[PDB]
């Protein structure tokens, strides 16, 4: 639709922290939009991308794709400032076909957003226990 | 039998410290069960595995195998980012044959558990003196 | 003869410090006895070896050999504990022949122990000045 | 002539510091004499060499050569002692011929010792400005 300052509420292990994002333009090379947290150093900030795609003569299917990464700085050595030690990636891809209606496309998104809060799935991610 | 919270008492040089473990599922790829200490970071915790095996057309013998490792963290560089300095393993394998009764299988376990507390053996491990 | 706790007195630049050693068995692979200082970590302790040898069909001479090493440990920043950074070794080999009597063998040892306290030799070692 | 404790006065940016040196023998391998500052660790001390040479059947010219180096050491970071980080070498070579008298040989030394205190030369070394 149109980029804006996407705000977010009730995020965390408790669900009390918030997070605000700012738009940072659309890359016209490959259609990838971007959002970012208002940080200072451009390698210590959270970012979110999103990029729809279109069927060519090769692929013949739509493909929505969302990426999230979260660097965490630490390890100040000496008196120079902080540098990145770890990463935490994410990925979501959709593969809707051509003649699909919109109830199906909403149903997939709805059940994914509901299934990311089931007790099995937070047992799987937050504790790294395999489903058994 | 069935996994549960295996508790342990009188462990140490003095025999006063305790240790509690929690079950973390059975890997169905190779039958290896697992236990673990309730830690936060998944590379700074003690773990114990155990895996019985069965005779195939190649091996023709049962084989019980137990592994123990104990990493030791250094938090010199800051609590948020500790690095494992060094490790310390263990290994126990049994090789009982097919027609063995159960008194023999209990006798081997009993004499191993008794021989790991003889003065010769704690002279060997705790001081690294060769038996002479 | 027989290993025991070899004690030592009047050692140092002033000759006031002492040092005590403990026996740690005889390696039967190559006849090398060992002594050690009662330390905790097995890479931060002083050690002394001694190993007589016998004439084979190839060498035809006795060969007494004594080795001494003294590791130095300091702890660098952001590290939980001591490491080893410099060592100072030593070596003494004797090559007595077959028909030698015992007065000669005592005379060599006596003049070596006397010559390691002459002013020329402590000028050579403790100051690294070449003999000129 | 003969080695002795060469003392020095009025050295520095202000010309108030002093420096004393001690003889440390003549290397008979290549005629290179040596002086040194009375330090403890043999890699953290200033040293000065000097070595005359003689005409062979190949070179046919005398060659006096003087070398100076000054290591500098930064202080402890943990407790482990002083290390060497940078060096500052120097070099002076002379190439007097065979039939040269002594007034010429004194004149070269005199004008070099006078020219190392001209304002152009201390503008060149102490500020690293090229002569322009």
């Amino acid at each position, epitope marked *: 639709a149109k980029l804006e300052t996407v705000t977010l509420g009730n995020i965390g292990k408790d669900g009390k922290q918030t997070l605000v994002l700012n738009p940072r333009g659309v890359n016209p090379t490959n259609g990838v939009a971007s959002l970012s947290q208002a940080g200072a150093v451009p390698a210590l900030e959270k970012r979110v991308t999103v990029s729809v795609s279109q069927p060519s003569r090769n692929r013949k299917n739509y493909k929505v794709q969302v990426k999230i990464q979260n660097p965490t700085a630490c390890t100040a050595n000496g008196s120079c400032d*902080p540098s990145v030690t770890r990463q935490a990636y994410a990925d979501v891809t959709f593969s809707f076909t051509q003649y699909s209606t919109d109830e199906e496309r909403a149903f997939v998104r709805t059940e994914l957003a509901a299934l990311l809060a089931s007790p099995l799935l937070i047992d799987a991610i937050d504790q790294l226990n395999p489903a058994y | 039998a069935k996994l549960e919270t295996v508790t342990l008492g009188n462990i140490g040089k003095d025999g006063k410290q305790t240790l509690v473990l929690n079950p973390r599922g059975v890997n169905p790829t190779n039958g290896v069960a697992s236990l673990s200490q309730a830690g936060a970071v998944p590379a700074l915790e003690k773990r114990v595995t155990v895996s019985v095996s069965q005779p195939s057309r190649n091996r023709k013998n049962y084989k019980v195998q137990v592994k123990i490792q104990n990493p030791t963290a250094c938090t010199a560089n800051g609590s948020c980012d500790p690095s494992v300095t060094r490790q310390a393993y263990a290994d126990v394998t049994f090789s009982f044959t097919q027609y063995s009764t159960d008194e023999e299988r209990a006798f081997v376990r009993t004499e191993l558990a008794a021989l790991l507390a003889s003065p010769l053996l704690i002279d060997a491990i705790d001081q690294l003196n060769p038996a002479y | 003869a027989k290993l025991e706790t070899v004690t030592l007195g009047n050692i140092g630049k002033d000759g006031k410090q002492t040092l005590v050693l403990n026996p740690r068995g005889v390696n039967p692979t190559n006849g090398v006895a060992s002594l050690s200082q009662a330390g905790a970590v097995p890479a931060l302790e002083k050690r002394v070896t001694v190993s007589v040898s016998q004439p084979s069909r190839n060498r035809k001479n006795y060969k007494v050999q004594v080795k001494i090493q003294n590791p130095t440990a300091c702890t660098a920043n952001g590290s939980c504990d001591p490491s080893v950074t410099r060592q100072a070794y030593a070596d003494v080999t004797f090559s007595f022949t077959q028909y030698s009597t015992d007065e000669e063998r005592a005379f060599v040892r006596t003049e070596l122990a006397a010559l390691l306290a002459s002013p020329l030799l402590i000028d050579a070692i403790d100051q690294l000045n070449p003999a000129y | 002539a003969k080695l002795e404790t060469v003392t020095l006065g009025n050295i520095g940016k202000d010309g108030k510091q002093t420096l004393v040196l001690n003889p440390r023998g003549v290397n008979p391998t290549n005629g290179v004499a040596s002086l040194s500052q009375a330090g403890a660790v043999p890699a953290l001390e200033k040293r000065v060499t000097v070595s005359v040479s003689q005409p062979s059947r190949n070179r046919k010219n005398y060659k006096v050569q003087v070398k100076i180096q000054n290591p500098t050491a930064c202080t402890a970071n943990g407790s482990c002692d002083p290390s060497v980080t940078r060096q500052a070498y120097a070099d002076v070579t002379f190439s007097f011929t065979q039939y040269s008298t002594d007034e010429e040989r004194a004149f070269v030394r005199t004008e070099l010792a006078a020219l190392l205190a001209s304002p152009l030369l201390i503008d060149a070394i102490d500020q690293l400005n090229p002569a322009y």
Partner: antibody
Amino acid sequence: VQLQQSGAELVRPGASVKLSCKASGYTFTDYYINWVKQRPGQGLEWIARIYPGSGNTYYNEKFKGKATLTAEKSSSTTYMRLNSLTSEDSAVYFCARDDVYPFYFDYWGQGTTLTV
Amino acid sequence: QIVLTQSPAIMSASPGEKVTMTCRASSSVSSSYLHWYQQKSGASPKLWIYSTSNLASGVPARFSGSGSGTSYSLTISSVEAEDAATYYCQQYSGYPYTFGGGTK
């Protein structure tokens, strides 16, 4: 999780003192421990810092030869020693625990005054 | 090596106003290293703002620090009674730490 220091005291000048604050409620050798001087009429400043699991002391250059401090691992305390006492130092002395990424001080203890 | 200046030293209290104190360094103290503490009239201090942006646990809703560079500030909106005692600030750059002068 807390830590308490000591009571009030006074010494006559020229002497030397001991101070201590004992920790409780966490594993002792895993966090740094500092000391902090607050002269009462003025702003408050920092003096020394040591890690108990090793021996590593870094100190302020104003008070470089004034204070020495050690740490005993068994009783889980930390001793600090002054010398050549005078009427220049008469203040409350704090000790606080931190770890390291954003260097700030977690947990302050109640202060120990000192008079000369 | 680094010197702080907190430009007010005394302030007045009225329960509806909007008050703000600032601080200024003598060099480029980096962000995310500097903090704010409030000390009561007769007790040990405690944390108020860490890394100049977010808040501690027992902090109420309305105090918010800001600033980028070498001149930072804390802004109080809707002050009430039993709030203002002292406000120090301190940062760590290079090596010896240094605290603020103080304000109230």
